[PDB]
Amino acid sequence: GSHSMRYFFTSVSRPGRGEPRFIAVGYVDDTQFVRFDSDAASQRMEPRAPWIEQEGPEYWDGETRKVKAHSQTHRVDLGTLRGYYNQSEAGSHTVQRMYGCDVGSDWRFLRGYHQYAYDGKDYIALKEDLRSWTAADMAAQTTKHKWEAAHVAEQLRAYLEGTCVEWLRRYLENGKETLQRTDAPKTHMTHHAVSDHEATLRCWALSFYPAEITLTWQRDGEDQTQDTELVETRPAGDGTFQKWAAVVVPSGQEQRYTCHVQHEGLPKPLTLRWE
């Protein structure tokens, strides 16, 4: 199965309440493995999964130096955008930044990412060809021209297609127990009378990994998408995920409905029916 590595960074200004807040997090597929928080006491990159914990001191020291350096770039960036939009120094602003790489089933480079947002909207993004940029507006065209002259896209491409993929594979191997695990969902249905002639049928999927899953209801084999309540996939807290789907049925028609489950950890898609 395909895999990914991602770094997510958030910077928030606090006019007059000290310097900006900066939070950095890193993930491998849906498992988080490191963090950095500018308000914390350590001032270092920190482990968030057991498998990265025994990387030696040279790894930790290098990641800490790099994440500090990114922090400071975001401190300057908040002032720069403030000038580009001619905003006051009294409002609170947010900068977000992401980068990553996806590899396929053969563990081979498939795609690379790098983009920024300002106050919740797209500002600038590297295109899929890893040579061009998408600028959201007039302010972002100024950044794009700067980055074109300094040949920033070339530098990003060597990281996304090279280094990113090499360390992703190394992580996949070292954390194999956690990261190469496939956990099939534990499923079951509940039935609850809401009235004297209707009932709620709920279809559950628990303790699964990874997060991706398809869970739907059918009536006589026909799609019921507009009458199904589907909750967002969510974390159980122990490294696994959960999800449910429900439909309100007329009493007497329970047998017409089927719950369909699809996931990587299942040998064949599942079909459940209350009966």
Binding site: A69, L81, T143, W147, A150, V152, Q155, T163, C164, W167
Partner: peptide, 9 residues
């Protein structure tokens, strides 16, 4: 492993 090049907007 995080990138070690830090560009500015």
């Amino acid at each position: 492993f995080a990138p070690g090049f830090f560009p500015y907007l």
